[PDB]
Every structure is written in C-alpha cells, then in structure tokens.
Symmetry: C2
Subunit: 101 residues, 2 copies
C-alpha cells in the first residue's frame, strides 16, 4: 500500500519514500518506525509498542529468553516443575512469585 | 535483603542462593528474573515487565533507539521538527502519525 502525507509518499511494500516524487534515502530503523506509525493512524504508540512492532526480531528473542529463565528456575527450585509452587503463571497477566505466606 | 521460601534462601545483594544452606550455581539471567519475581511478591509480571526489570540495559537501549528514529524522521519530514505536524507526541501515551485528514 502507499500512504501520502504532505509532499511525501511512502510505499509500505517496497520501502520507497518520495519527497514530491524525488526519492529519500531511508534507513531501515527509520522505515520500520515510520511504517508502524502510519499503519496505526491517529493511534498513539508507546516506545514499548514501537519496539514490538519495529524491532520485532530482538524484541521476541528477549521475550523467549524470559521463558527460558523461568523454565530453568522451575527446574532448579520446584519439586514438580510442571506444577510449580513458588514460580507460578497467571495466564494473561504474567509470571508470579507465591511466598510461603 | 534475604528472601526465604521452601528450602531456599536468596540474598538479593550478593546474588547467593542456597538449597538448605548448600550453594546453588545461579546464572545471571536466572538471578535477575528470580530477583524481579520475588521483589514483587504475589504480583504477576508479564514478559515485557520482566524484560524491563531484568534486561534493563538492552531494554533501555531499545527504548532510546526508538527516540533516535523519531528524531531523525522529524528532521527529514517536518517543516518545523520542533512543532511536527505528522509525527507527533501525546505525552503519557506515545508517538502518533496524524494524517492530512
């Protein structure tokens, strides 16, 4: 798709940008953030959201690493890691430490 | 501070962990996530939150990079980058594309 604004045209598919139909040299970090913003018109996007959308590779890898730590901590700490007592999950909200209290 | 649960003691300050007072060899990724969880007892923490808390270095760097892209896009696109028309800010919520519409 092609988004126009002001004197600019942005082609989401090929990553070409034009200032009144002369090409502008876009960085790939510039393109990914701009694409996220104009794909979500009038919708404010926080930095965390832009990181998810525009640096998805690194972001996801950080997400999977969290799961590996959790899985390793359960292996070390829990009597049954499939039914952990201290390092638990509440679906939809996150991981949680549940004290003896 | 020292947190106990089950047979385990965790010293937040020195990063020592003990299974009934024999030391367990903790990885630094394991320690940071465990520390985040037990610093927030009974509070569920999503992966994104754990990334902020436990991989703060890489997380923040990703945050600052988003700002550099925004600043570079405004320099390229806006007639007055100090008062941008298309790539705007709503404080507390995020960056936003504002179409000609």
């Amino acid at each position: 798709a092609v988004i126009a604004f002001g004197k600019f045209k942005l082609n989401l598919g090929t990553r070409e940008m034009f200032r009144e139909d002369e090409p502008m040299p876009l960085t790939s970090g510039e393109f990914a953030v701009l694409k996220a913003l104009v794909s979500h018109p009038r919708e404010p996007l926080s930095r965390d959201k832009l990181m998810n959308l525009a640096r998805g590779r690194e972001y996801s890898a950080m997400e999977r690493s969290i799961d590996v730590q959790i899985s390793r901590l359960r292996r070390m700490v829990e009597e049954d890691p499939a039914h952990p007592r201290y390092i638990q999950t509440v679906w939809g909200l996150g991981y949680v430490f549940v004290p003896d209290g």
